[PDB]
Amino acid sequence: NFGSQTPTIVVLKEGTDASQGKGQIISNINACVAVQEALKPTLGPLGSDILIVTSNQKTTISNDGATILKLLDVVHPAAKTLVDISRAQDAEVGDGTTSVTILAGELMKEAKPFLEEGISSHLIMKGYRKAVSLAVEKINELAVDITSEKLERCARTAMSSKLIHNNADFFVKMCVDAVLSLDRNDLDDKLIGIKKIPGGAMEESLFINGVAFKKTFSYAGFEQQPKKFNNPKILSLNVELELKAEKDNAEVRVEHVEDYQAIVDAEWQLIFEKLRQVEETGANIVLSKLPIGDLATQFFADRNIFCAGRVSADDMNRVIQAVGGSIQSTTSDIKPEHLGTCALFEEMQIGSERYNLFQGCPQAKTCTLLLRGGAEQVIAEVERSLHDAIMIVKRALQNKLIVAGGGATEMEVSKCLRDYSKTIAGKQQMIINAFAKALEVIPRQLCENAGFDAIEILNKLRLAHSKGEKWYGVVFETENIGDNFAKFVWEPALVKINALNSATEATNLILSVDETITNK
Amino acid sequence: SLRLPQNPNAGLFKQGYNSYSNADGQIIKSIAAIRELHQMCLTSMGPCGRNKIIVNHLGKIIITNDAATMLRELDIVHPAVKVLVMATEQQKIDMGDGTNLVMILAGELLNVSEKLISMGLSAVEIIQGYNMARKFTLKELDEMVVGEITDKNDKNELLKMIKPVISSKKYGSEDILSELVSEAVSHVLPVAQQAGEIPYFNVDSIRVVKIMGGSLSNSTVIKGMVFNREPEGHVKSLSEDKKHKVAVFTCPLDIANTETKGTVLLHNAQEMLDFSKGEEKQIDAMMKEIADMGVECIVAGAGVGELALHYLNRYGILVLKVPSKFELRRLCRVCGATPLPRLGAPTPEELGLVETVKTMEIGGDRVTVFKQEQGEISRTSTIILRGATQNNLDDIERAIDDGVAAVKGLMKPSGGKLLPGAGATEIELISRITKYGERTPGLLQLAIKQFAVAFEVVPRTLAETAGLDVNEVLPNLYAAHNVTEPGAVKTDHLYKGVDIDGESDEGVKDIREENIYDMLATKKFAINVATEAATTVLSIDQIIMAKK
Amino acid sequence: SLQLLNPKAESLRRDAALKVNVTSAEGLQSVLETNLGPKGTLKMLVDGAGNIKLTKDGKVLLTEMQIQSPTAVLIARAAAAQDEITGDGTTTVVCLVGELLRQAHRFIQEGVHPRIITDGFEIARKESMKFLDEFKISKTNLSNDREFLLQVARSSLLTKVDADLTEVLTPIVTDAVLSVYDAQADNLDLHMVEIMQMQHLSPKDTTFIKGLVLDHGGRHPDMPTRVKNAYVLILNVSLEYEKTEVNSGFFYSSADQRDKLAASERKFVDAKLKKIIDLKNEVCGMDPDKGFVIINQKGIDPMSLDVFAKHNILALRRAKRRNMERLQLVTGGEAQNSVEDLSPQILGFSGLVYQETIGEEKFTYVTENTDPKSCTILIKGSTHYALAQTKDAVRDGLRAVANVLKDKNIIPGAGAFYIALSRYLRSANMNKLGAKGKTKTGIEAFAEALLVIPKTLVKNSGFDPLDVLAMVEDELDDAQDSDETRYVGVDLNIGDSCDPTIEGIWDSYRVLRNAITGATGIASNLLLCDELLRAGRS
Ligand SMILES: Nc1ncnc2c1ncn2[C@@H]1O[C@H](COP(=O)(O)OP(=O)(O)O)[C@@H](O)[C@H]1O
Ligand SMILES: Nc1ncnc2c1ncn2[C@@H]1O[C@H](COP(=O)(O)OP(=O)(O)O)[C@@H](O)[C@H]1O
Ligand SMILES: Nc1ncnc2c1ncn2[C@@H]1O[C@H](COP(=O)(O)OP(=O)(O)O)[C@@H](O)[C@H]1O
Ligand SMILES: [Mg+2]
Ligand SMILES: [Mg+2]
């Protein structure tokens, strides 16, 4: 009435995306199948890697479902479910991140034609949620209660599909010793902190019973100190050893000029009193989070006392557990008993960077190896490969469960699901059998990357499960199919349980969605 | 002829202002504007309801099946639709249960009102019709009630309460999700049987901490609480029994600096020598009175200094950061400690009791646990919720808030007063309200009649979302109520309802053995606020907007 | 609702459309009502080309100025139909429609439906016809008195120009319809009078000519301008051939045949002109003071002007189509196209024919006819706008005096019919109601809307309308009881009531008929209009 136009009131804002119809949920499935296609050829040892460069021109080379999806800023809402399960699988277990993604995409891709039919959404979710309960129980029967024979074999399989798989003869021998230093019920991940060294060859690495940290600063009296101590003693400090303000303030009134000379000498008196208390206990190695001034390091440089600074708190916490000492933020409360010790000390040239080596302790909680390589991605790939393998042998100590690898777990579970679907209820026979053949995507693509024909493989797996009761899987060496127990290929069961639970939770999340709202 | 005069005397108001009167079918358009988002609610009610993706301008996504939650993020232009947003927001704040109903009922009252206004009924009579129907609706809800709880704590009774509530939001498996709530409700309640004390319960007591990884079956019920903190000095498993003591300080563990220009002043060298050692001896002397009381863990409220930390970890005193007000208050309720801001001796009566403080790897990050034991129970327990997708953690967490909100419904009224669910409570009111229309004379009878027709949406929605044909399932259910109460007592035709999965025909095998019911307090305010949503939209005949 | 069909559409419904119809009518009323009466103001229609024109008629003001509003287009179209059939009373139509919508909208705001309001206007309209047929008076026009036609013409021409020019021009209007009359057939043509546009001495120096006046002069100097006795001869075929319909060409065999084929065209010219020369000497040879003029519609060959110039023959060309009917009515001749048959009986007669050189052109004057059945009016003026002003004055004044002969009845003017019709439409007892408390609302609205005409005349004169109408009301209160039929008017000189019949103000019968009928129909349909819409493809 107040205007000749009379505009029609739109419900939502301008620019909001479309709504209900035909093809809304199918677009979310095709969006997941699109992301699933990129991670498709990266499966198994005979796969490939993915090269990505973001907007900031940071090069990265990897074949991990979490790392590839982390750098890619995914804006599609349904596609970020794959990002969440990858980080959830990477945070806890650290292996098989991909096998969780290429599996959830197949369940959603297998749910595509059922959604085109008149099947409701809840019927498909009830099938997977009822079938995954039997798959978890079936994997408990596939897994063994192994206790005999007292780590070595589990690490070789976790290093697959990336760089150090071929060098497993050298890296697995020292990687097993990394977790044996850690005792039960603690399992501290920060003690396995490893740093970057651009330059060198990966073969020249070695095992270290302690820590090796960069100094990150050149002091005036650094060269005067000896680099080799026969019986060193470590003492960790936190007080700032330099001439400056004492406690967060600076204001000094002086009336007489005779006392003006004494107040300056008092500052010189207390700073050497602070340093002399460190000298009297016989601490050869001095370490502090805060900076150390030139006055202190030259006082230590005269009488053969090494010192260093500019280190992080995470590095300091690794130093205490390696030497077995403690933190002392006051020089007056220093006692002889709290000083850590080791066998020897030697500063070595490593990639044009100096590192203070500690090794030979009788009881060390720390394993820290120097990663040297040609490119910055080589040292990064060796880190992620070891970080994924160290989690497997870490949790192998927590519980002793072993299942057959090479896609053998998926086939044995699928056969019982076909028997369970054959028996009862009629309607869900198509859904469970659809879940069965969709679960076989792991050995499907594992052989396609090997160059073998999938029909001859998949026909041999099904008809040979009777004599191949449980340990029946693929073998890449002889170009044939046989028992995996003789080949000594092992893998834990925790990757399989979390994969199906995360994949079943991922597909059921957006299967209960038929809408998409995007404001602005 | 080439151009109109374009609404003269339009300069009375600005060009951006527009009027919208009842004529020109605009009230029909407002009903159609409700119909746009109301159909979105059809596929979100019930156990087979489908969640919704809502991508905000910031990119924060929340996937959900609940009305009140989804309507917060959507920016709405139509004011009549915003009445439903604030009506459902009132439903979530007060009762925390029955928000789709507020949306699906009040939208259908406007739908059937589209037929009434088109027939020629005045708007004043329409409000009088639903108000007279509301007084009869709330009256009969108290009459057809069956069953009661009568016990605050029981293993089997809580399965009847929590399970029908969380069945709508993230149904999944029934037992693994219901046991996490029924175990946590028993921990926080002050039972105190045979004392005559007033019960008390807080919604903020039970709180869920989201941790990625794991699976839904690995979720456990923690007696205490949890944060993602790191001890500063050292970590301790604390295998020593003979329980430790707890002292809570809200001020930082440091020297109480002067609020007005705290600056050093040293006139001579004698003060320079003693000022460095004076701070060490002063901080040490304050820790002696604290350490002699046998305390081994202190929860700090703000940043702690390094000198104070050096004397705390000397005697093995754990340090915990809680840099906020509510995070510090929730922890005192567990151990039952009374904080004091002074840095002196904690009082022995005020010291808390915690047996063990463990630090283990759950989500890959460092977390600190405060599990109590059966002896010396505590309140404000937490639930470790494990899942793969962060979006699913958000909706399951709000399902616990809805379940915890349902436990609040037992404290204020005299008891439980459960009703039959699965559409049985809605379909019974259709016959009672229809009979009420026949008893009253006047032109308001059509308003009473259409009020009953609006209640068919609950069985029609559950039959549509369940993948069944509503034309056959709905009238098959009417046969149970068209055979009305014969001369025999103890008639069991009231428990007939719809069924999502199973037998043909659909009248469910009772909602009985199934153990699904509804709360009276939810239905009272839901029908009240839903009628107010339709009252305010139908009572207004002119709408004025600005800038659009 | 209309925006869903066409977003580019608009609609005003049931309150905004009513204000548009009433405000556009009142806005059109407030601008155009000032021209009503003799004291009205003059408007200057200055277009983009700089053409200046003075007028007071609402037809030409609305024709040149395009109307943007949709309501006023319907009122302008009503003024067109009024000016078309009648030629007078356009200002009364727009004032009645504006006042009827004003008085009606006063009651629509009181909660009355437009249907019964328009029902009262139609009953009030039919009641006015039963009042009008009794109010008129019959006179005998067989006497053909000049005094009645002068005062009737003076009433119509005073509303166009001031007094001194009206007295000069008011005999010209009465002289227009002297001989044009037929008692039995009752046929009277208005288009036979010819309006010539020319610049001369002044507007106040015009005069009436009995015979015809053409705007074409003699091409050759040798032909005589003064002719004492002329026999006209009507030609229609072109003496100068424009083009041969069948294509042809003269292909000569030798140079000797060139001038002979040029003479072949001379033979056909001499063939048709020889009968013209034979027609001259057939009447009488060597007769002084007896010319012979030829009026041709199409062009004349300049080569043939020497033949007409030797025999002293006046030849004119490029005459108008409607003038061919006017020649036989004035001169008493007979129209002819070809020259196959000729005789002295078909020829007309004229007592005096002369020409005058005014500027770069010459005008032919033919006067002194025996029994001419037509005439002409020279519109002389001192400018361009006075010609159009006097042309509109004559074209509006010819219809007022011509209607007296078409129908002998005539209504007194000076607002006498509008004042007398107000009382008659006050109380319809049991004559024509139709319903209780419904039709009477429209009867009151129609009665009050008719009295705006005498009030508008008083507003232009500069006196109070309520004061001068109070004595008019008091006069007619005692006139009914005095047992004497008396018609009262409105005198704008002193501001006092008057007698139209005594003073000399009259209105035509067909003006009030079409004005009340056209205004009531447009006022009814605009009240029934509840919504305005627009739609189309740009
Ligand atoms: N030595 C091996 N022989 C056969 N199959 C293997 C071997 N090592 C790994 N696999 C298979 O490769 C699959 C993927 O494991 P892996 O490469 O460690 O992680 P990702 O899933 O990220 O590729 C597993 O399902 C496993 O069965
Ligand atoms: N398994 C089931 N069988 C039959 N009816 C059910 C089942 N689960 C839920 N319902 C019914 O569906 C209705 C959904 O209520 P709803 O408004 O979604 O609750 P909330 O307020 O928690 O969202 C309930 O009132 C209940 O009666
Ligand atoms: N001299 C006059 N005195 C009083 N009224 C007059 C006079 N001349 C004209 N009128 C009134 O003006 C009205 C319209 O006359 P006129 O102006 O000639 O037509 P129009 O308004 O169409 O130009 C007539 O109804 C008549 O009553
Ligand atoms: Mg791997
Ligand atoms: Mg509920």
Ligand SMILES: [Mg+2]
């Ligand atoms: Mg006139």
